[PDB]
Design a protein around this ligand. Structure first.
Ligand SMILES: NC(=O)c1ccc[n+]([C@@H]2O[C@H](COP(=O)([O-])OP(=O)(O)OC[C@H]3O[C@@H](n4cnc5c(N)ncnc54)[C@H](OP(=O)(O)O)[C@@H]3O)[C@@H](O)[C@H]2O)c1
Ligand SMILES: Nc1nc(=O)c2nc(CNc3ccc(C(=O)N[C@@H](CCC(=O)O)C(=O)O)cc3)cnc2[nH]1
Ligand SMILES: [Mn+2]
Ligand SMILES: [Mn+2]
Length: 159
């Protein structure tokens, strides 16, 4: 199955200047828990934003140009990215905006974090059709001394 995972601020903002404009330790822990031991597909700008390979995961980077780092796998099309994952139960697509748009029609599950933060951004999660999706899990958390915003973890499944 293909799944997307993302953290969204207000108005579906996901990034600004090739970075994320918040620091939510609890959300990165959720990201790690839901991606470890799975392949992760990302676009080249997200690869540069993370800045290093993610441990315990097969890292697959989409770019139209040849690769520049043999610690990760480089592919040149969506279909090649999927194939490079081979025969696993669940493929995690970890962004960014352009990559999420291309994989959304192919996805069966969304792992969304809704963050109560107002930030200017330059990248948005796609504007998906809510009627297509069933919420199967939601868990709200208030802000605390480690996490400066409230946030809600949600899992949706395609109906
Ligand atoms: N909040 C979140 O959960 C989250 C998650 C991930 C990323 N982000 C943010 O998202 C932003 C980056 O997103 P973005 O939309 O600018 O970029 P992106 O989707 O990460 O990367 C786009 C690049 O991927 C390559 N690519 C995409 N589709 C391709 C295809 N079909 N075939 C070949 N190459 C393909 C191209 O690289 P080439 O130009 O080399 O061809 C393209 O320029 C950053 O701000 C980052 O912090 C946020
Ligand atoms: N829910 C969610 N939150 C995010 O912040 C997120 N970020 C990306 C892409 N950017 C990043 C940036 C950093 C790390 C990162 O350093 N992760 C470590 C955290 C380890 C920990 O908290 O102990 C990792 O091992 O996954 C992951 C993805 C994609 N989907 C997301 N999805
Ligand atoms: Mn806030
Ligand atoms: Mn919902």
């Amino acid at each position: 199955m293909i799944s997307l995972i993302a953290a969204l601020a207000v108005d579906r903002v996901i990034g600004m200047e090739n970075a994320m404009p918040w620091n939510l330790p609890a959300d990165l822990a959720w990201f790690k828990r839901n991606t470890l031991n799975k392949p992760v597909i990302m676009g080249r700008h997200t690869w540069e934003s993370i800045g290093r390979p993610l441990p315990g995961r097969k890292n697959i980077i989409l770019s139209s140009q040849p690769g520049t780092d043999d610690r990760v796998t480089w592919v040149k099309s969506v279909d090649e990215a999927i194939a490079a994952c081979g025969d696993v139960p669940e493929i995690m697509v970890i962004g960014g905006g352009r990559v999420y748009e291309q994989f959304l029609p192919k996805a069966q599950k969304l792992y969304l974090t809704h963050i109560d933060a107002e930030v200017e951004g330059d990248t948005h999660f796609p504007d998906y059709e809510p009627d297509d999706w069933e919420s199967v899990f939601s868990e709200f958390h208030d802000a605390d001394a480690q996490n400066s915003h409230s946030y809600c973890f949600e899992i949706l499944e395609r109906r």
